[PDB]
Design a protein around this ligand. Structure first.
Ligand SMILES: *[C@H](C)[C@H]1/C(=C/c2[nH]c(/C=C3N=C(/C=C4\NC(=O)C(CC)=C4C)C(C)=C\3CCC(=O)O)c(CCC(=O)O)c2C)NC(=O)[C@@H]1C
Ligand SMILES: *[C@H](C)[C@H]1/C(=C/c2[nH]c(/C=C3N=C(/C=C4\NC(=O)C(CC)=C4C)C(C)=C\3CCC(=O)O)c(CCC(=O)O)c2C)NC(=O)[C@@H]1C
Ligand SMILES: N[C@@H](CCC(=O)O)C(=O)O
Ligand SMILES: N[C@@H](CCC(=O)O)C(=O)O
Ligand SMILES: N[C@@H](CCCC[NH3+])C(=O)O
Lengths: 160, 161, 160, 161, 161, 160, 160, 161, 160, 161, 161, 160
């Protein structure tokens, strides 16, 4: 969370938080209700966001659901959408925390090593997450889509 | 370390769950009074050297502890002791902002009792000095914020005992 | 500034800025208008802030303006206020930058060596800067005095 | 390095001046754009590998340069070239966040022409690739951010010539 | 570490003896197998990632261990687990080349059980995964080399128990 | 070559070549005629080795020549077989040099970075090289296939 | 002492003491009676050395005994003289040891941090020690004042 | 470490006392022995290799300890053992110059018994060798200096037991 | 051996053995029978090699077996031949290992320190080992004497 | 560095060619006489210290160069000079094995003339000492191998001039 | 570095000569000045900060050099300048004790003019400050020692020009 | 010299010479005439010191003047005495300098490498220098022999 990130940064310099850092935490707490509402839109629409993102991905990358592809067949395709649902869940955690740390610690450290071992094309996983961003944005105000978008972009960039 | 928010996220994550009503109520509980934590931390930061100075004056100075034979005798030992009190105040303030004492176990208390015992640093006098820091801090941040800071000062003292 | 600090930290790790670093820049620039207003109050009141701070200082540190004192006499007292005016100018730079780096680079690295050579009691320089903080605080809201105060406090602590 | 803010502070400091109206106007100009610079940097970071891939496909591939005898032939040289383009994009992004090209002189261009000349790295082909990165970047970040990124891409190319 | 040759030399040296008939028989035994050990090591190196992938698919995936609450949940823990299996295969290959398990005691097993117990890494699941690596390796290197690799896989598993 | 590798290893330890290194060079030069003959079999049969390896790869990985796949279409498929011909050429260089250094310096350093940028699944490139090993082995004695096989295995393992 | 310093230097070079180090120990112990007499003069005159040094300091630094000053009032002034008496005691230890390490270990490590916390201007503490040097010097031969002076100078320089 | 001078300073400092008549008389007592300590140290330094050679010949050579299976077998272990005896003589000489054994606790004995036990160095044989060094040293420096050196050799031996 | 050296080097780089390291192991084990035969000639003739080397040494260096000499008298001369027998045994270990490491670890590290302490002239020990080389060479083919000679030369050079 | 084999491979690789008849004839030229290079290198290695000793005795000793005022006067300068001759012999042997002088440009000669000129190391006397090494080496490896070694000794000498 | 003693030893050594009458007379000439050099060095050491303070006041302060735009503007540059003057006084004092300027070439002047020119440190002003240090030093140590110190101050200044 | 050693030590600690270093220089120059007389007595007696030391060495180390020995024959024996005369000359330089560094820089750095190349047993060179010490001591007062002896001892120890 923004609170832990601020504490870790201050502790690394053996110092108290600055007035500016404390003001950032005040803004975070005052905006908490709005962040919970944004996270709740993604939670409430998770089935449609994941389903439509999967459809967009498989239209761009039909090879991954073709013979020899990592997601070929009903069971592997379902597992692929299960992973997209994991990443959407992590994006909701990042939004409420005001920081990508929960996403990083749960879903990013070691992600290239995991998908390399599985033979999953991680560029296509990133495309699935980018598709979820686009579907989620359709359910949000321009302002709320801007906020949520940063968390999806973090995941996409961390997989590239 | 964990804070009040990450503790909730972690409990949802181990279940593979999106945040449910009970989790959201715990997050709302942090947001409801988080500005009071920020206000207390602002006051403590602005007064950190003065808090330690007053606590030392009230609990340690002009005693056997600072005279020849005492554990705060020599400039090196005096300086080590006020450095430790500075640490206790700084980390208690972090823990109060976080609403979670985990940073104290991770960054303050791990091996501390053993270090003090091996060097002959008196735990009783350290606990008296932390009690003085708690009282001086409470005078500056007000009784309610002083009680919350007291939770973390008491956590450190218990960790020494 | 926080922009340069973020870039230097990212470059040291051969990476793009983190989402946290980018959020810190967003928070910094959203406060820009308020920082410029604080800097302008100090700039516009610089003669009175320095003059009144000097008067307050000589009462706390009579030694420096007593015979044998570093600031004894009209010319040396004027040079003392010249130095306080330098530090007020640097505090305005720190306020607009959102960090102490301009103050550090111009007025703090080597400050103990310079004043030791000149025979200036640096505790009394710190007292003059603390007096400027108190005069400036009278011209500012509690919130704005908190922000400006961090920069005065940095200078006082670096001299103590 | 300097950013747009520190450049103003430094120009005022060398004159011994408080920030004057002209200096304050430059600071206001930076603050009014900061969020747009962050938005562009976020987009570029998320797409950095894809930007270089598309630029390389447009400007370098299926030519004498990637065939035996060309300077991008061998996996080591192919990888070195895309690493250079990754550097140009990452540093141009820093310069755009800073609103100042000084980081490019300090950390990118110092001795670069001499290095390329000593190794036989073709400057003309590198400049064509940077032009392609400018076009691909502008397609993703929009016209205003694309023009601003273009200033820093062109600054790097000029520094090679 | 010792290899099969140095183990014989060292046992003769502690007795102050020239190599006797029993020692020479052990040396002949190693020399007669050296090329077969190199052939197996060449095959394992070329297939190391694929061996671990197949073992993980057979022994760990689609279970409580990879789901939330399981010890392979989170990308960091998944990656740490396959890193451990990569270590077991690489060190078992060294031990097979050496014809001696001493490298496993020195570089793999020293404090390993204690590390796994302190972190909550499940030993039973690890032993099942090593058994799967043994089976997949034997399919690639053939029965005799598979049996020899099996000695070192079993040595690692025993060291965890 | 084995000669350069031996010299570089000896120079790193500020020493003359070891008796082991010199024996390897003696064995290498005595076996030179045989290594040239093995390399000439691969050279003479390069069309069939590359064509049959491609067919084996595309049977196991039809996704790479399906829509969305990196080798989709006649031109991209031809470029894929061009890369297999590059690696066969490098394998002939390693065989004549008695060492993988020419393979490493021309085709392995940076290989993961190159194919990641291109979007080529490097596991499938490794599969193509493994298929060339199997086709080439059919044109060689058991002994000669053993020697050539080490060089193909080096490439396959370096792409994992 | 000079004996420990010689042993520490020899141990750092894994060697027996040098002929020069052994000669310096012989010369040190032959001069021991004279060093003990210097320490005895400072000990016997400690009340007058500290009292006169305090008066000289408070004339040069009237701020420290003026309202707001660290030593303001009878009790705080007595504590200030207590500290000068501590430093005179340490100077006698250095003189008998022929080495500054006893002074360093008791009264110098952390001294800036201790006095900063107390609000005591350490430049004024250094001035008090310099005043003790000047008062003590009048009680000693030119040779003995030279020897004692080095230990007072060590303390003054270690507080600067 | 402390020497006879700093021992007196430390005992006065813990009381907050200037050196009194009794303390000054203890310093005079040390200064009156300084030349005798230097004379002994000069003789030991000039004969250091010969002292260890004779002690080893008397206590260790032509035994199971130097033959295969013994702890002084191999040139590396023989050299390590005589290096240890060289250390004991050099540090005992420092302690005798200092008139204080504290250097032995700080620089020789801290963890030494544990190191020897972990490596299988025989402590009984080491103590016999130190006894031999004590006897050879006493023969060269004379009875009074031999007795004083014996205090420090015995201190090292006791520290191993 | 080259097997352990290759494993230690590979482990230091967290990698499988290189093709070059594996080829060196193949060459090493293919020579095993020849190395065992050379070691067996030295082992079978150990009494004559040591006796004749001792006689050659004492003819070249009569001082070591003359009054005042380290090997003077029946018992000391027997101990001298005991040491030459140790070195011949270590040479047989080096020959079977295909490198000097067993000789280094058992008989060379600390050798100068041991013989210096004993008062044994190490140049004469080296002469005894050089004499063993010459006697052993008479029992070997030119090729086998070349191989064995490197191990004797290592010992002679390590004592000079 | 390059050797005779890698030079041929590189010339084929820059053309994108499998080894053609002309390339194979150059490789056969190395293989035809490579055993003679190994035989010479074996002899030089076994005699390396003796070659330098005899060359120094023939060309440098009992002259103004080793007497006070000469550049080999002082033990430090004597040792540096024989170290340089050891380097020339070792690197000439590598170049002879490689059949290519490139290692001499890369690892011996780059900046060497400038280093010698700055230190006052006389190039004339160095060239005389290298000529002596060439003659002593030729006496041991025979005239034909001595001529090939002479190519590399002359390459080093020319590089100093 | 060389001193007046080692200058004589070095000139005798290059001739291979024991110290002759001329060498011994030169050494006697240095020994006859040693106490005067120590007396001057003692005075300079006791006044080192005061010498630099007075020289700076006479030559640099209240000028364009200390104001914004000048090379001594900013505390970092002011401190760097007085550190340089502290170096010149400390090294000139060493050279005077040695009776030889070689330490100035070895430890002060090597690359110094080039460093100052690259940074924009004004050499004219530096030479004026060193002239002021020479005058202030001469006032404290008296005419003969002032002249000798002046040789080394002038040596540093010449080395900057 | 002692002056250079004091300056090098002071420069390493960025400090002026210590009072102890300055006192040692004063004591050194006051004894300079006596040091010069020691160097003159060794210079005047150099032929006899070297001749008698050679005789003692060749009696203790007959091997070096026996067939195969480094000093065998009239010419090589003369060169051996030439080297002892070099070391006596260097000892006179150390005596006048009050420091071993002149000896170290001319005759010790690289000495083992020089004598190893020449085949000279350096322990016998050390014996020759130890023999010169004994002859020189007979020409000097007990105090002057003690001083000269330290410089002979330095050379002997540096060759062990
Ligand atoms: C006198 C020149 C200056 C001065 C002194 C002053 N000091 C104190 C308080 C203390 N000083 C010490 C000192 C030491 N403790 C040690 O272990 C050593 C090493 C031997 C020293 C030198 C301590 C511990 C204290 C705290 C009180 C105590 O003894 O427990 C004060 C009192 C400040 C107060 O407000 O209580 C003063 C006045 N003050 C000046 O301004 C002079 C320049
Ligand atoms: C013979 C060529 C020369 C010679 C030999 C000599 N050696 C000794 C005594 C010892 N030698 C050893 C050697 C070793 N210990 C090891 O662990 C190894 C490695 C395998 C070696 C080589 C040891 C330990 C001793 C000490 C006695 C013991 O065994 O405990 C002597 C005896 C000397 C004495 O004074 O007792 C001699 C004579 N001497 C020469 O002059 C020859 C040139
Ligand atoms: N050195 C500190 C660190 C404490 C910690 O790691 O928590 C201690 O002994 O406690
Ligand atoms: N070090 C040598 C050679 C340089 C190199 O190795 O390239 C020199 O100073 O010139
Ligand atoms: N002594 C200074 C006085 C400065 C005047 C500024 N108030 C000078 O020479 O200028």
């Amino acid at each position: 969370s923004i609170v832990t990130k601020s504490i870790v940064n201050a502790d690394a310099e053996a110092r108290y938080l600055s007035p500016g850092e404390l003001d950032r935490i005040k803004s975070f707490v005052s905006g908490g209700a709005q962040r919970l509402r944004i996270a709740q839109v993604l939670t409430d629409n998770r089935e449609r966001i994941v389903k439509q993102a999967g459809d967009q991905l498989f239209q761009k990358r039909p090879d991954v659901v073709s013979p020899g592809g990592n997601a070929y067949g009903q069971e592997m395709t379902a597992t692929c959408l299960r992973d997209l649902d994991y990443y959407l869940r992590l994006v909701t955690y990042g939004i409420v925390a005001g920081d990508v740390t929960p996403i990083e610690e749960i879903g990013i450290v070691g992600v290239r090593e995991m998908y390399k071992s599985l033979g999953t094309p991680i560029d296509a996983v990133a495309g699935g997450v980018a598709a979820m961003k686009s579907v989620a944005a359709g359910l949000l105000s321009a302002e709320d889509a801007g906020e949520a978008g940063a968390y999806f972009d973090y995941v996409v960039g961390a997989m590239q | 370390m964990q804070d009040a928010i990450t503790s909730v996220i972690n409990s949802s994550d181990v279940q593979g769950k999106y945040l449910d009503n009970a989790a959201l109520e715990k997050l709302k509980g942090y947001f409801a009074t988080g500005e009071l934590r920020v206000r207390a931390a602002t006051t403590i930061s602005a007064n950190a050297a003065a808090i330690v100075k007053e606590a030392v004056a009230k609990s340690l100075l002009y005693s056997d502890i600072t005279r020849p034979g005492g554990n705060m005798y020599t400039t090196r030992r005096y300086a080590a002791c006020i450095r430790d009190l500075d640490y206790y105040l700084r980390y208690a303030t972090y823990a109060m902002l976080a609403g979670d004492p985990s940073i104290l176990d991770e960054r303050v208390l791990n091996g501390l009792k053993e270090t003090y015992n091996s060097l002959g640093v008196p735990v009783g006098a350290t606990v008296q000095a932390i009690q003085a820091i708690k009282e001086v801090t409470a005078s500056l941040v007000g009784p309610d914020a002083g009680k919350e800071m007291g939770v973390y000062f008491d956590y450190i003292c218990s960790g020494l005992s």
